[PDB]
């Protein structure tokens, strides 16, 4: 038996982890109506993308990995002797990448494809990749790994803050009054992931208090977990995420694993500027 683990680009794993474990990545893309295209990778400048988003009078569109990017990587790993491929995708409730990875697995002969719906995104989804890789080293078969990841999914979630109200109306999800009235009070919509979908949770005035709301809600949940891994997932507001990150280091015990990360263009294309989230996993994920 020879098991491999791959994922899509929205897992936002560091290039250090990608290189160390030779993780293959099927990238997503974001295409402005300028015709400008950004294929997600650890090479494009995230600052250039945020500048084009502010300059673009229309919101861009994101695309799942094309049914083909999966196929070549499936063919490449099978050639290298891999008998089973575990594919970790972002939430099927917000993207079709999970479906494309499954359908492409039906067209590649001579290798078993085990597509997994993480029901999340960013480094929270990447935690499923690092848990699968760890289990392969310990001698687990793919079915035990899928069952473990399915159990892990039961104690995994995330809350997030929306900051760019201008980006919301450019997409049409809010009005002009609500956009205008919202920025003057500085109302921050707080949302959370639930069964792979993003649903409204609270509406909080000022970003500082919404960050404190993220901390209280997540901490109240992970108190009951035997193992805890917390992930600050920040946008382009460096000071916002660092404040929450350092606040967690002071308020949480060392038994909690607390880490910091940032999301890429595909997530930024939907969140806009100033996005910030707090994810959690009920496990002690190996981040090295
Ligand atoms: C703390 C973890 C969560 C951080 C915030 C993540 C919110 C994600 C927003 C929606 C992204 C949609 C991606 C669609 C991809 C596609 O085109 O198939």
Residue numbers in the entry: 1 to 288
The study reports:
Staphylococcus aureus FakB1 is a prototypical bacterial FA transfer protein that binds palmitate within a narrow, buried tunnel. Here, we use a combination of X-ray crystallography, NMR spectroscopy, MD simulations, site-directed mutagenesis, and functional biochemical assays to characterize the membrane-bound conformation of FakB. This study focuses on FakB1, an FA transfer protein from S. aureus that binds palmitic acid (16:0) before presenting it to FakA for phosphorylation and exchange with the membrane. The bacterial class of FA transfer proteins is called FakB, and the bound acyl chains are completely enclosed within the protein interior. The open conformation arises from a conformational change in the dynamic region that rotates helix α8 outward to uncover the FA-binding tunnel and reorganizes the adjacent α8-β9 loop into a new amphipathic helix.
The crystal structure of FakB1(A121I) was determined at 2.02 Å resolution. We observed two molecules (molA and molB) in different conformational states in the asymmetric unit. The prototypical FakB1 closed conformation was exemplified by molB, but in molA, the dynamic region undergoes a significant structural rearrangement. Specifically, Arg173 disengages from the FA and Ile94, helix α8 (Leu165 to Ser171) moves away from the protein, and residues 175 to 186 form a new α-helix that rotates away from the protein by ∼180° in concert with the movement of helix α8. Excluding the structural rearrangements observed in FakB1(A121I), the open and closed structures superimpose with an RMSD of 0.356 Å showing that the conformational change is confined to these residues. In FakB1(A121I), the bulkier side chain displaces the middle of the aliphatic chain of the FA by 0.9 Å and its distal end by ∼1.4 Å that, in turn, shifts the tunnel residues Val162, Leu191, and Leu271 and pushes against the dynamic region. In the open conformation, Arg173 becomes disengaged from FakB1, and the newly formed 12-residue helix that we designate as α8′ has a distinct exposed hydrophobic surface consisting of Ala177, Trp180, Val181, Leu184, and Leu185. We also note that the disengagement of Arg173 from the FA and the outward movements of α8 and α8′ disrupt the hydrogen bond network surrounding the FA carboxylate by breaking the key Ser171-His270 hydrogen bond and exposing His270 to solvent. The FakB1(A121I) is the highest-resolution crystal structure and was used as the representative open conformation for further analysis. Analysis of the open FakB1(A121I) crystal structure reveals a groove created by the conformational change that forms a channel extending from the FA-binding site to the electropositive end of the protein.
